[PDB]
Design a protein around this ligand. Structure first.
Ligand SMILES: C[C@H]1CN(S(=O)(=O)c2ccccc2)[C@@H](CCc2c(F)cccc2NC(=O)CC(c2ccc(F)cc2)c2ccc(F)cc2)CN1
Ligand SMILES: [Cl-]
Ligand SMILES: [Cl-]
Ligand SMILES: [Cl-]
Lengths: 99, 99
């Protein structure tokens, strides 16, 4: 698909058996999801920018379905104000910026 | 151009006759640049990031060139960690997300 940017590019995703809304963010290196349970090992990480930093749990090798496209990668879980799909997963679905 | 997301989507911008590097960010509603002098009056604005809200200065109808494409619009100035081109200007240059 082609997504315009008149409004926030929010899409439905499937992660850990749950349907969630997430923002496609070209300006995020990593994917960050609001508090939820995920399987496997995790390690702590700090991520931040505007308004400072937050502590998150880093889970590796997590499968996500974004607009019918399956992708696998690291997912950070923590107190983010919005679910964010970062470049680590946007590359896997072949997402590009065009102008 | 078509920009892939294996690296951060950093481009050259020109604002106030100066070249700067900025990130194309589909996850940002607005454009925010690091401290610099802009003409005219400014208005107060709060923007929310991953860690909370920050105060910035809102300047309107500012001329800015993004990757060679001319735009004229709102530019926020504040303590952002990187210069960010948000949807207000990405729409002006005809930027879309495609997969
Ligand atoms: C370059 C980084 C800079 N920041 S970040 O927080 O520092 C960060 C740094 C490292 C990792 C993750 C995030 C982000 C954009 C922030 C931003 C601007 F920069 C300029 C102008 C506006 C805004 N904010 C929004 O538009 C609100 C919006 C939002 C998106 C991401 C977010 F995290 C927090 C909030 C939103 C809120 C609620 C909701 F329901 C839906 C969407 C992402 N790109
Ligand atoms: Cl990854
Ligand atoms: Cl590619
Ligand atoms: Cl604008």
């Amino acid at each position: 698909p082609q997504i315009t940017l008149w409004k926030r590019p929010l899409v439905t995703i499937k992660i850990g058996g749950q349907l969630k809304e997430a923002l496609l963010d070209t300006g995020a290196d990593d994917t960050v999801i609001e508090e939820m349970s995920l399987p496997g090992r995790w390690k702590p990480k700090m991520i931040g920018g505007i308004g400072g930093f937050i502590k998150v749990r880093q889970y590796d090798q997590i499968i996500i379905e974004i607009c019918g496209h399956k992708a696998i990668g690291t997912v950070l879980v923590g107190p983010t104000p919005v679910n964010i799909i970062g470049r680590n997963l946007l590359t896997q679905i072949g997402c590009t910026l065009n102008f």
